[PDB]
Amino acid sequence: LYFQSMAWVIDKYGKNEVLRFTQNMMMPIIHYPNEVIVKVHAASVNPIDVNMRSGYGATALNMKRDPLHVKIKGEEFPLTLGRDVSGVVMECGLDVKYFKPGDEVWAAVPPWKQGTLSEFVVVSGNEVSHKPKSLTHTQAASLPYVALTAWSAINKVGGLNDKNCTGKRVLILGASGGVGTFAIQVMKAWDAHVTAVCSQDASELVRKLGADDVIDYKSGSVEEQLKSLKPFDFILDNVGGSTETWAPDFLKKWSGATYVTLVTPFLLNMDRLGIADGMLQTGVTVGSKALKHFWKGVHYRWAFFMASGPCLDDIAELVDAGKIRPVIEQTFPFSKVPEAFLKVERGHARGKTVINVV
Numbered sequence: 371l372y373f374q375s376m377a378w379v380i381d382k383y384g385k386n387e388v389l390r391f392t393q394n395m396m397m398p399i400i401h402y403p404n405e406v407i408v409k410v411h412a413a414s415v416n417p418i419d420v421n422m423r424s425g426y427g428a429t430a431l432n433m434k435r436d437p438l439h440v441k442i443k444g445e446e447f448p449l450t451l452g453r454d455v456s457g458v459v460m461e462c463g464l465d466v467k468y469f470k471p472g473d474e475v476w477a478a479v480p481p482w483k484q485g486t487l488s489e490f491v492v493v494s495g496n497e498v499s500h501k502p503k504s505l506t507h508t509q510a511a512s513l514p515y516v517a518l519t520a521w522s523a524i525n526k527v528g529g530l531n532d533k534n535c536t537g538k539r540v541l542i543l544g545a546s547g548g549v550g551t552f553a554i555q556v557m558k559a560w561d562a563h564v565t566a567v568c569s570q571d572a573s574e575l576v577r578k579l580g581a582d583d584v585i586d587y588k589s590g591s592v593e594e595q596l597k598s599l600k601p602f603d604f605i606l607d608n609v610g611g612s613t614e615t616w617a618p619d620f621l622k623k624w625s626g627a628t629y630v631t632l633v634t635p636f637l638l639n640m641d642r643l644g645i646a647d648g649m650l651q652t653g654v655t656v657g658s659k660a661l662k663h664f665w666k667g668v669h670y671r672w673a674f675f676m677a678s679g680p681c682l683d684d685i686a687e688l689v690d691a692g693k694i695r696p697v698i699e700q701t702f703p704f705s706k707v708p709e710a711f712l713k714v715e716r717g718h719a720r721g722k723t724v725i726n727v728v
């Protein structure tokens with residue numbers, strides 16, 4: 371009689387033990403005419419998933435989940451994590467025009483929506499794209515969240531594109547993870563010269579992906595090494611913290627060189643101080659740092675993941691043209707999501723961890 375479906379959900383924030391498997395998920399529902407229901411075939415685990423499991427961003431994300439303050443506390447639960455999906459379209463609302471049942475699609479889901487570690491996921495038409503024809507679901511599911519994060523930082527915030535990168539020198543701090551391994555490749559597709567900073571053991575990987583130079587950040591003479599290279603037109607910082615104290619100094623000055631960071635206290639400030647005071651603090655940091663770097667002749671920018679079907683269509687074109695490859699470290703069956711989370715939580719990513727749902 372009833373329709374039941376499967377998911378990994380959490381009922382409270384905490385350590386990995388909060389993960390719970392249920393075969394009693396309700397059927398997915400189209401609430402708005404621009405939504406699409408997708409059968410999840412594969413999903414990837416992202417550090418944002420492990421962090422959100424522990425409560426990270428809860429304050430800000432709850433405001434996003436319920437703008438009106440019309441829901442009660444703990445109303446996000448049960449919460450399905452997972453941001454990436456490769457799969458097949460089951461149903462569309464009446465305003466979706468470019469997708470239909472049976473299409474093979476991928477998407478990155480915003481953090482404030484129910485996630486993809488489930489049999490089905492509801493997404494908005496503007497977040498979804500036809501997946502690369504050349505990739506399996508497993509391969510494709512590794513890409514959307516990291517690719518869109520990289521795209522936001524590089525293209526949208528950085529202003530770099532296929533026409534203006536030729537012979538620009540790019541530094542990627544943290545080149546061996548999900549974002550970095552995508553970033554190396556999109557930058558080489560646009561003919562930039564790429565310097566990758568990563569651990570010694572990742573060096574072969576990042577070179578095969580197209581890194582021109584590699585710096586081992588534990589080599590103990592990173593400064594003399596960077597000092598020995600020409601300056602950079604662009605730095606993508608995926609490490610953060612102390613990197614900001616030395617890395618901007620290696621950009622060309624007074625030439626529109628840009629430092630973009632993906633590691634910010636945006637969500638942490640609101641967790642610690644609340645929405646109003648956290649947002650204030652974030653603004654003070656943003657404003658003082660932008661001006662201070664402007665005075666030293668560089669643009670300093672923050673960048674964030676942003677969901678985009680149209681950007682995914684551009685990415686799928688690069689994949690199918692052979693310019694971007696998926697980099698999958700490991701796959702886990704659906705029954706081993708907790709194990710996949712522990713692996714991610716242990717660190718030292720070399721590309722991506724994918725969950726096979728089908």
Ligand SMILES: NC(=O)C1=CN([C@@H]2O[C@H](COP(=O)(O)OP(=O)(O)OC[C@H]3O[C@@H](n4cnc5c(N)ncnc54)[C@H](OP(=O)(O)O)[C@@H]3O)[C@@H](O)[C@H]2O)C=CC1
Nearest residue numbers: 519544546547548549550567568569632673674675718719
């Ligand atoms: N603002 C935003 O919207 C987003 C920000 N991000 C940021 O980027 C990271 C997540 O991205 P992702 O690419 O998926 O993460 P990963 O976990 O897949 O990759 C991070 C990589 O960084 C390496 N690393 C750690 N320390 C250093 C260092 N000091 N120098 C060079 N490499 C280092 C790790 O390897 P090893 O430790 O072995 O060197 C690992 O390969 C997080 O820090 C996250 O905040 C991610 C998504 C969205």
Ligand code: NA
Nearest residue numbers: 507508726728
């Ligand atoms: Na598969």
